[PDB]
């Protein structure tokens, strides 16, 4: 049988992303739009900084900017927490510790508003070096592939994960961003709590040659595996 959650993702779904951020008192907002195709694990999104110049590097926000679009192959259907929580949705929280620098704390609600899948985020960053790799914009505009290990969090009726993102620094070195994550359903309904598994990610960042606002174009693929 097909679940309500699964059914909401059988075709291409429009996405809206909204973020209000404050990093060391540098306040900013970002809007994003695009589409997700969960059958292929495929996200196509464009983000705009609506407040002017983004005060942090775009790559540092990629993980923050909708895992309900992951491709869960048929044999893993009973392990797809993210879709099972829909349409009421889930809260996705992270702390992201930038090694030798500050940290982001993010809280997002991911849910449907009509036919649009919305990721609404608040981000708070503190303890950054005003001249470091983040506030000093020393990170390359690119992105590495990663596997993320997902575990059930039974107590919380959700999932958790921790994983390392390594951002390439302009001098050939790497800026580690250690991610700690917890997701919990918004509604009171049942969800699917998964066996341990992983998600394989690839992300490509580009620019729209006709766009004059500070922005990022993201093509991201995410597939579940045992």
PDB file of C-alpha atoms in Angstrom:
ATOM      1  CA  UNK A   1       0.000   0.000   0.000  1.00  0.00           C
ATOM      2  CA  UNK A   2       1.073   3.591  -0.687  1.00  0.00           C
ATOM      3  CA  UNK A   3       1.029   6.066   2.218  1.00  0.00           C
ATOM      4  CA  UNK A   4      -0.316   9.624   2.138  1.00  0.00           C
ATOM      5  CA  UNK A   5       3.184  10.960   2.652  1.00  0.00           C
ATOM      6  CA  UNK A   6       4.616   8.956  -0.244  1.00  0.00           C
ATOM      7  CA  UNK A   7       1.746  10.000  -2.495  1.00  0.00           C
ATOM      8  CA  UNK A   8       2.550  13.689  -2.056  1.00  0.00           C
ATOM      9  CA  UNK A   9       5.916  13.189  -3.784  1.00  0.00           C
ATOM     10  CA  UNK A  10       5.060  11.045  -6.814  1.00  0.00           C
ATOM     11  CA  UNK A  11       5.579  13.908  -9.280  1.00  0.00           C
ATOM     12  CA  UNK A  12       7.518  17.191  -9.414  1.00  0.00           C
ATOM     13  CA  UNK A  13       6.783  19.413  -6.396  1.00  0.00           C
ATOM     14  CA  UNK A  14       7.384  23.165  -6.174  1.00  0.00           C
ATOM     15  CA  UNK A  15       9.615  24.302  -3.320  1.00  0.00           C
ATOM     16  CA  UNK A  16       9.812  27.539  -1.370  1.00  0.00           C
ATOM     17  CA  UNK A  17      12.708  28.204   1.003  1.00  0.00           C
ATOM     18  CA  UNK A  18      12.730  31.114   3.485  1.00  0.00           C
ATOM     19  CA  UNK A  19      15.579  31.939   5.851  1.00  0.00           C
ATOM     20  CA  UNK A  20      16.083  34.705   8.383  1.00  0.00           C
ATOM     21  CA  UNK A  21      19.635  34.775   9.666  1.00  0.00           C
ATOM     22  CA  UNK A  22      21.759  36.629  12.192  1.00  0.00           C
ATOM     23  CA  UNK A  23      25.471  35.754  12.325  1.00  0.00           C
ATOM     24  CA  UNK A  24      27.485  37.814  14.827  1.00  0.00           C
ATOM     25  CA  UNK A  25      24.756  40.462  14.498  1.00  0.00           C
ATOM     26  CA  UNK A  26      24.956  40.538  10.705  1.00  0.00           C
ATOM     27  CA  UNK A  27      21.292  40.121   9.797  1.00  0.00           C
ATOM     28  CA  UNK A  28      20.133  38.781   6.471  1.00  0.00           C
ATOM     29  CA  UNK A  29      17.272  37.065   4.699  1.00  0.00           C
ATOM     30  CA  UNK A  30      17.221  34.590   1.826  1.00  0.00           C
ATOM     31  CA  UNK A  31      14.381  33.389  -0.375  1.00  0.00           C
ATOM     32  CA  UNK A  32      14.653  30.317  -2.595  1.00  0.00           C
ATOM     33  CA  UNK A  33      12.478  28.685  -5.185  1.00  0.00           C
ATOM     34  CA  UNK A  34      12.580  25.641  -7.376  1.00  0.00           C
ATOM     35  CA  UNK A  35      11.410  22.075  -7.656  1.00  0.00           C
ATOM     36  CA  UNK A  36      11.967  18.631  -6.216  1.00  0.00           C
ATOM     37  CA  UNK A  37      11.574  15.244  -7.854  1.00  0.00           C
ATOM     38  CA  UNK A  38      11.789  12.570  -5.157  1.00  0.00           C
ATOM     39  CA  UNK A  39      11.672   9.712  -7.659  1.00  0.00           C
ATOM     40  CA  UNK A  40      15.122  10.888  -8.808  1.00  0.00           C
ATOM     41  CA  UNK A  41      16.251  12.460  -5.507  1.00  0.00           C
ATOM     42  CA  UNK A  42      16.652  15.683  -7.458  1.00  0.00           C
ATOM     43  CA  UNK A  43      16.536  19.295  -6.233  1.00  0.00           C
ATOM     44  CA  UNK A  44      16.825  22.343  -8.440  1.00  0.00           C
ATOM     45  CA  UNK A  45      16.843  25.578  -6.414  1.00  0.00           C
ATOM     46  CA  UNK A  46      17.782  29.224  -6.769  1.00  0.00           C
ATOM     47  CA  UNK A  47      18.389  31.397  -3.720  1.00  0.00           C
ATOM     48  CA  UNK A  48      18.481  35.170  -3.471  1.00  0.00           C
ATOM     49  CA  UNK A  49      19.794  37.284  -0.589  1.00  0.00           C
ATOM     50  CA  UNK A  50      16.916  39.727  -0.321  1.00  0.00           C
ATOM     51  CA  UNK A  51      18.714  42.024   2.157  1.00  0.00           C
ATOM     52  CA  UNK A  52      21.756  42.776  -0.033  1.00  0.00           C
ATOM     53  CA  UNK A  53      25.121  41.035   0.236  1.00  0.00           C
ATOM     54  CA  UNK A  54      25.137  37.674   2.031  1.00  0.00           C
ATOM     55  CA  UNK A  55      27.477  38.125   5.043  1.00  0.00           C
ATOM     56  CA  UNK A  56      28.564  34.449   5.004  1.00  0.00           C
ATOM     57  CA  UNK A  57      29.686  32.227   2.110  1.00  0.00           C
ATOM     58  CA  UNK A  58      26.854  30.607   0.135  1.00  0.00           C
ATOM     59  CA  UNK A  59      28.345  27.096   0.514  1.00  0.00           C
ATOM     60  CA  UNK A  60      27.947  27.301   4.310  1.00  0.00           C
ATOM     61  CA  UNK A  61      24.130  27.405   3.889  1.00  0.00           C
ATOM     62  CA  UNK A  62      23.696  24.471   1.450  1.00  0.00           C
ATOM     63  CA  UNK A  63      22.874  21.879   4.110  1.00  0.00           C
ATOM     64  CA  UNK A  64      20.404  24.274   5.756  1.00  0.00           C
ATOM     65  CA  UNK A  65      18.549  25.046   2.522  1.00  0.00           C
ATOM     66  CA  UNK A  66      14.424  19.209   2.229  1.00  0.00           C
ATOM     67  CA  UNK A  67      15.256  15.549   2.696  1.00  0.00           C
ATOM     68  CA  UNK A  68      11.670  14.509   1.967  1.00  0.00           C
ATOM     69  CA  UNK A  69      12.929  14.710  -1.655  1.00  0.00           C
ATOM     70  CA  UNK A  70      15.508  11.969  -1.151  1.00  0.00           C
ATOM     71  CA  UNK A  71      15.176   8.960  -3.398  1.00  0.00           C
ATOM     72  CA  UNK A  72      14.225   6.060  -1.148  1.00  0.00           C
ATOM     73  CA  UNK A  73      14.246   2.994  -3.406  1.00  0.00           C
ATOM     74  CA  UNK A  74      11.290   0.670  -3.069  1.00  0.00           C
ATOM     75  CA  UNK A  75      13.062  -1.777  -0.764  1.00  0.00           C
ATOM     76  CA  UNK A  76      13.675   1.088   1.696  1.00  0.00           C
ATOM     77  CA  UNK A  77      10.150   2.567   1.625  1.00  0.00           C
ATOM     78  CA  UNK A  78       9.475   1.616   5.233  1.00  0.00           C
ATOM     79  CA  UNK A  79      12.473   3.695   6.317  1.00  0.00           C
ATOM     80  CA  UNK A  80      11.519   7.065   4.859  1.00  0.00           C
ATOM     81  CA  UNK A  81      10.814   9.218   7.933  1.00  0.00           C
ATOM     82  CA  UNK A  82      10.813  12.476   6.011  1.00  0.00           C
ATOM     83  CA  UNK A  83       7.893  11.749   3.698  1.00  0.00           C
ATOM     84  CA  UNK A  84       5.943   9.873   6.406  1.00  0.00           C
ATOM     85  CA  UNK A  85       5.699  13.131   8.398  1.00  0.00           C
ATOM     86  CA  UNK A  86       3.938  14.927   5.530  1.00  0.00           C
ATOM     87  CA  UNK A  87       1.923  16.975   4.969  1.00  0.00           C
ATOM     88  CA  UNK A  88       2.002  18.292   8.557  1.00  0.00           C
ATOM     89  CA  UNK A  89       5.786  18.151   8.371  1.00  0.00           C
ATOM     90  CA  UNK A  90       8.787  18.055  10.657  1.00  0.00           C
ATOM     91  CA  UNK A  91      11.147  20.302  12.550  1.00  0.00           C
ATOM     92  CA  UNK A  92      14.776  20.022  11.477  1.00  0.00           C
ATOM     93  CA  UNK A  93      17.290  21.387  13.951  1.00  0.00           C
ATOM     94  CA  UNK A  94      21.044  21.563  13.674  1.00  0.00           C
ATOM     95  CA  UNK A  95      24.090  22.904  15.325  1.00  0.00           C
ATOM     96  CA  UNK A  96      26.938  23.377  12.869  1.00  0.00           C
ATOM     97  CA  UNK A  97      30.331  23.904  14.497  1.00  0.00           C
ATOM     98  CA  UNK A  98      32.897  25.512  12.247  1.00  0.00           C
ATOM     99  CA  UNK A  99      36.269  24.296  13.466  1.00  0.00           C
ATOM    100  CA  UNK A 100      38.350  27.153  14.903  1.00  0.00           C
ATOM    101  CA  UNK A 101      35.450  29.501  14.277  1.00  0.00           C
ATOM    102  CA  UNK A 102      31.823  30.086  15.274  1.00  0.00           C
ATOM    103  CA  UNK A 103      28.689  27.994  15.109  1.00  0.00           C
ATOM    104  CA  UNK A 104      25.299  28.101  13.444  1.00  0.00           C
ATOM    105  CA  UNK A 105      22.147  26.949  15.188  1.00  0.00           C
ATOM    106  CA  UNK A 106      19.287  26.361  12.788  1.00  0.00           C
ATOM    107  CA  UNK A 107      15.636  25.561  13.342  1.00  0.00           C
ATOM    108  CA  UNK A 108      13.479  24.808  10.319  1.00  0.00           C
ATOM    109  CA  UNK A 109       9.931  23.714   9.684  1.00  0.00           C
ATOM    110  CA  UNK A 110       9.474  21.635   6.556  1.00  0.00           C
ATOM    111  CA  UNK A 111       5.818  21.180   5.579  1.00  0.00           C
ATOM    112  CA  UNK A 112       3.302  21.605   2.767  1.00  0.00           C
ATOM    113  CA  UNK A 113       1.394  24.804   2.177  1.00  0.00           C
ATOM    114  CA  UNK A 114      -1.051  23.589  -0.416  1.00  0.00           C
ATOM    115  CA  UNK A 115       0.982  22.026  -3.187  1.00  0.00           C
ATOM    116  CA  UNK A 116       4.237  23.828  -2.281  1.00  0.00           C
ATOM    117  CA  UNK A 117       6.809  22.192  -0.045  1.00  0.00           C
ATOM    118  CA  UNK A 118       8.102  24.941   2.294  1.00  0.00           C
ATOM    119  CA  UNK A 119      11.386  24.975   4.234  1.00  0.00           C
ATOM    120  CA  UNK A 120      11.176  27.904   6.681  1.00  0.00           C
ATOM    121  CA  UNK A 121      14.368  28.472   8.633  1.00  0.00           C
ATOM    122  CA  UNK A 122      15.759  30.634  11.419  1.00  0.00           C
ATOM    123  CA  UNK A 123      19.571  30.662  11.674  1.00  0.00           C
ATOM    124  CA  UNK A 124      21.617  32.134  14.509  1.00  0.00           C
ATOM    125  CA  UNK A 125      25.394  32.271  14.315  1.00  0.00           C
ATOM    126  CA  UNK A 126      27.669  33.321  17.143  1.00  0.00           C
ATOM    127  CA  UNK A 127      31.340  33.381  18.071  1.00  0.00           C
ATOM    128  CA  UNK A 128      32.637  33.885  14.532  1.00  0.00           C
ATOM    129  CA  UNK A 129      35.945  35.565  13.722  1.00  0.00           C
ATOM    130  CA  UNK A 130      34.992  38.761  11.902  1.00  0.00           C
ATOM    131  CA  UNK A 131      38.065  38.165   9.682  1.00  0.00           C
ATOM    132  CA  UNK A 132      37.900  34.345   9.531  1.00  0.00           C
ATOM    133  CA  UNK A 133      36.964  32.001   6.718  1.00  0.00           C
ATOM    134  CA  UNK A 134      33.231  32.579   7.102  1.00  0.00           C
ATOM    135  CA  UNK A 135      32.781  36.286   7.826  1.00  0.00           C
ATOM    136  CA  UNK A 136      35.898  36.977   5.711  1.00  0.00           C
ATOM    137  CA  UNK A 137      34.513  35.057   2.705  1.00  0.00           C
ATOM    138  CA  UNK A 138      37.541  32.775   2.195  1.00  0.00           C
ATOM    139  CA  UNK A 139      35.606  29.686   1.075  1.00  0.00           C
ATOM    140  CA  UNK A 140      35.579  28.529  -2.531  1.00  0.00           C
ATOM    141  CA  UNK A 141      32.278  28.496  -4.391  1.00  0.00           C
ATOM    142  CA  UNK A 142      32.057  24.721  -4.746  1.00  0.00           C
ATOM    143  CA  UNK A 143      30.870  21.661  -2.847  1.00  0.00           C
ATOM    144  CA  UNK A 144      31.940  18.094  -2.133  1.00  0.00           C
ATOM    145  CA  UNK A 145      29.925  14.864  -2.159  1.00  0.00           C
ATOM    146  CA  UNK A 146      29.043  13.366   1.224  1.00  0.00           C
ATOM    147  CA  UNK A 147      27.354  10.363   2.811  1.00  0.00           C
ATOM    148  CA  UNK A 148      25.205  11.034   5.863  1.00  0.00           C
ATOM    149  CA  UNK A 149      24.353   8.259   8.341  1.00  0.00           C
ATOM    150  CA  UNK A 150      20.742   8.475   9.530  1.00  0.00           C
ATOM    151  CA  UNK A 151      19.660   6.925  12.825  1.00  0.00           C
ATOM    152  CA  UNK A 152      16.262   6.660  14.474  1.00  0.00           C
ATOM    153  CA  UNK A 153      15.709   8.700  17.610  1.00  0.00           C
ATOM    154  CA  UNK A 154      12.922   6.616  19.163  1.00  0.00           C
ATOM    155  CA  UNK A 155      12.593   8.750  22.291  1.00  0.00           C
ATOM    156  CA  UNK A 156      11.933  11.786  20.123  1.00  0.00           C
ATOM    157  CA  UNK A 157       9.815   9.978  17.557  1.00  0.00           C
ATOM    158  CA  UNK A 158      12.253  11.090  14.877  1.00  0.00           C
ATOM    159  CA  UNK A 159      15.743  10.876  13.443  1.00  0.00           C
ATOM    160  CA  UNK A 160      19.212  12.192  14.169  1.00  0.00           C
ATOM    161  CA  UNK A 161      22.479  12.457  12.323  1.00  0.00           C
ATOM    162  CA  UNK A 162      25.939  13.820  12.688  1.00  0.00           C
ATOM    163  CA  UNK A 163      28.272  14.382   9.775  1.00  0.00           C
ATOM    164  CA  UNK A 164      31.236  16.413   8.616  1.00  0.00           C
ATOM    165  CA  UNK A 165      31.134  18.861   5.750  1.00  0.00           C
ATOM    166  CA  UNK A 166      34.506  20.040   4.514  1.00  0.00           C
ATOM    167  CA  UNK A 167      34.471  23.375   2.740  1.00  0.00           C
ATOM    168  CA  UNK A 168      37.435  24.078   0.496  1.00  0.00           C
ATOM    169  CA  UNK A 169      39.308  27.206   1.640  1.00  0.00           C
ATOM    170  CA  UNK A 170      40.774  29.423  -1.093  1.00  0.00           C
ATOM    171  CA  UNK A 171      44.341  28.473  -0.087  1.00  0.00           C
ATOM    172  CA  UNK A 172      43.883  24.721  -0.638  1.00  0.00           C
ATOM    173  CA  UNK A 173      43.055  23.943   2.974  1.00  0.00           C
ATOM    174  CA  UNK A 174      39.651  22.905   4.370  1.00  0.00           C
ATOM    175  CA  UNK A 175      37.161  24.438   6.776  1.00  0.00           C
ATOM    176  CA  UNK A 176      35.385  21.725   8.715  1.00  0.00           C
ATOM    177  CA  UNK A 177      31.692  22.198   9.505  1.00  0.00           C
ATOM    178  CA  UNK A 178      30.643  19.545  11.993  1.00  0.00           C
ATOM    179  CA  UNK A 179      26.880  19.000  11.777  1.00  0.00           C
ATOM    180  CA  UNK A 180      24.672  17.664  14.574  1.00  0.00           C
ATOM    181  CA  UNK A 181      21.036  17.154  13.604  1.00  0.00           C
ATOM    182  CA  UNK A 182      17.688  16.194  15.140  1.00  0.00           C
ATOM    183  CA  UNK A 183      14.341  15.972  13.350  1.00  0.00           C
ATOM    184  CA  UNK A 184      10.956  15.658  15.029  1.00  0.00           C
ATOM    185  CA  UNK A 185       7.426  15.522  13.609  1.00  0.00           C
ATOM    186  CA  UNK A 186       5.210  18.615  13.812  1.00  0.00           C
ATOM    187  CA  UNK A 187       1.923  16.695  13.917  1.00  0.00           C
ATOM    188  CA  UNK A 188       0.661  14.066  16.364  1.00  0.00           C
ATOM    189  CA  UNK A 189       0.323  11.366  13.715  1.00  0.00           C
ATOM    190  CA  UNK A 190       2.430   8.264  13.198  1.00  0.00           C
ATOM    191  CA  UNK A 191       5.722   8.367  11.341  1.00  0.00           C
ATOM    192  CA  UNK A 192       8.159   5.784  10.024  1.00  0.00           C
ATOM    193  CA  UNK A 193      11.254   5.364  12.205  1.00  0.00           C
ATOM    194  CA  UNK A 194      14.084   3.952  10.092  1.00  0.00           C
ATOM    195  CA  UNK A 195      16.767   1.369  10.582  1.00  0.00           C
ATOM    196  CA  UNK A 196      20.238   2.866  10.313  1.00  0.00           C
ATOM    197  CA  UNK A 197      21.060   3.759   6.721  1.00  0.00           C
ATOM    198  CA  UNK A 198      22.739   6.455   4.751  1.00  0.00           C
ATOM    199  CA  UNK A 199      21.981   9.230   2.328  1.00  0.00           C
ATOM    200  CA  UNK A 200      24.403   9.941  -0.485  1.00  0.00           C
ATOM    201  CA  UNK A 201      24.616  13.572  -1.529  1.00  0.00           C
ATOM    202  CA  UNK A 202      26.075  15.480  -4.432  1.00  0.00           C
ATOM    203  CA  UNK A 203      25.719  19.221  -4.825  1.00  0.00           C
ATOM    204  CA  UNK A 204      26.710  21.555  -7.651  1.00  0.00           C
ATOM    205  CA  UNK A 205      26.754  25.328  -7.192  1.00  0.00           C
ATOM    206  CA  UNK A 206      26.475  27.825 -10.024  1.00  0.00           C
ATOM    207  CA  UNK A 207      25.508  31.380 -10.911  1.00  0.00           C
ATOM    208  CA  UNK A 208      22.730  32.771 -13.094  1.00  0.00           C
ATOM    209  CA  UNK A 209      24.475  35.072 -15.610  1.00  0.00           C
ATOM    210  CA  UNK A 210      21.395  37.329 -15.732  1.00  0.00           C
ATOM    211  CA  UNK A 211      21.059  37.739 -11.976  1.00  0.00           C
ATOM    212  CA  UNK A 212      22.449  40.882 -10.368  1.00  0.00           C
ATOM    213  CA  UNK A 213      21.403  40.122  -6.799  1.00  0.00           C
ATOM    214  CA  UNK A 214      23.684  38.037  -4.575  1.00  0.00           C
ATOM    215  CA  UNK A 215      22.449  34.480  -5.209  1.00  0.00           C
ATOM    216  CA  UNK A 216      23.198  30.768  -5.536  1.00  0.00           C
ATOM    217  CA  UNK A 217      21.929  28.152  -7.956  1.00  0.00           C
ATOM    218  CA  UNK A 218      21.946  24.652  -6.449  1.00  0.00           C
ATOM    219  CA  UNK A 219      21.571  21.297  -8.158  1.00  0.00           C
ATOM    220  CA  UNK A 220      21.507  18.606  -5.488  1.00  0.00           C
ATOM    221  CA  UNK A 221      20.896  14.853  -5.637  1.00  0.00           C
ATOM    222  CA  UNK A 222      20.177  12.722  -2.583  1.00  0.00           C
ATOM    223  CA  UNK A 223      19.681   8.957  -2.558  1.00  0.00           C
ATOM    224  CA  UNK A 224      19.152   6.516   0.286  1.00  0.00           C
ATOM    225  CA  UNK A 225      21.096   3.295   0.572  1.00  0.00           C
ATOM    226  CA  UNK A 226      21.264   0.422   3.030  1.00  0.00           C
TER     227      UNK A 226
END
